[PDB]
Amino acid sequence: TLSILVAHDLQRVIGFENQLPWHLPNDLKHVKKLSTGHTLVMGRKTFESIGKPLPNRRNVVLTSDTSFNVEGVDVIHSIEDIYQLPGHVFIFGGQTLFEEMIDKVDDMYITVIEGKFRGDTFFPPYTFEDWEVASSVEGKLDEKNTIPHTFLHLIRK
Numbered sequence: 001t002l003s004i005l006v007a008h009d010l011q012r013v014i015g016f017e018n019q020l021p022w023h024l025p026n027d028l029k030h031v032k033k034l035s036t037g038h039t040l041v042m043g044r045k046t047f048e049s050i051g052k053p054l055p056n057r058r059n060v061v062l063t064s065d066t067s068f069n070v071e072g073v074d075v076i077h078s079i080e081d082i083y084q085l086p087g088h089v090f091i092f093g094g095q096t097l098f099e100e101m102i103d104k105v106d107d108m109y110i111t112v113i114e115g116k117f118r119g120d121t122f123f124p125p126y127t128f129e130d131w132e133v134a135s136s137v138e139g140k141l142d143e144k145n146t147i148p149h150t151f152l153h154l155i156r157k
């Protein structure tokens with residue numbers, strides 16, 4: 001299975017200055033739950049911003065850099081390489097990867113951040129005409145989680 005995994009705001013903002021625009025522990029938990037034991041595929045800029053591979057799953061980085069060889073990370077140099085990865089593969093970001101893969105994935109796991117943030121990177125536009133809502137779950141608000149959010153699982157019609 002090939003899935004997108006993304007958190008975007010009301011205007012599809014996903015990032016600002018190579019970082020996430022918001023702080024939301026519950027969404028980190030969501031990512032951990034979904035992708036532990038599976039595979040994340042991410043672009044070079046996203047990886048470098050994270051700074052190290054995420055524990056307990058396969059980390060795959062897409063880059064043109066022939067010198068990229070990082071401990072605990074597998075490198076790919078083409079989009080076509082993604083389709084050779086076994087198991088459940090999550091396209092993890094950032095903007096460039098989402099733009100390349102939105103028309104190809106089976107599935108999308110989207111956290112809608114119910115606010116409007118300043119961004120410089122965006123998830124591509126999509127229409128519910130193309131996607132069935134398999135599930136929609138309101139995020140619980142906390143002292144630690146203060147931005148309303150909704151976990152959507154969308155399946156390509």
Ligand SMILES: NC(=O)C1=CN([C@@H]2O[C@H](COP(=O)(O)OP(=O)(O)OC[C@H]3O[C@@H](n4cnc5c(N)ncnc54)[C@H](OP(=O)(O)O)[C@@H]3O)[C@@H](O)[C@H]2O)C=CC1
Pocket residue numbers: 005006007008013014015016017018019020042043044045046047049062063064065077078079092093094095096097098100121
């Ligand atoms: N909120 C969210 O759900 C998420 C947000 N983000 C955010 O997204 C932003 C980063 O996005 P963006 O700037 O697009 O960067 P990306 O993370 O998508 O990385 C882009 C890089 O990936 C490599 N790459 C992409 N496609 C190919 C290809 N076909 N062949 C070879 N290499 C390729 C290139 O690396 P190179 O130049 O080295 O060749 C390219 O410069 C950040 O702000 C981050 O915070 C990221 C993930 C999730």
Ligand SMILES: CCc1nc(N)nc(N)c1C#CCc1cc(OC)ccc1OC
Pocket residue numbers: 005006007018019020027028030031046049050054091092093109110111
């Ligand atoms: C944790 C944010 C997130 N949520 C969802 N639902 N999907 C995603 N693809 C992402 C992401 C990301 C990239 C990223 C993660 C991170 O913590 C692991 C720290 C920095 C990041 O990029 C700036």
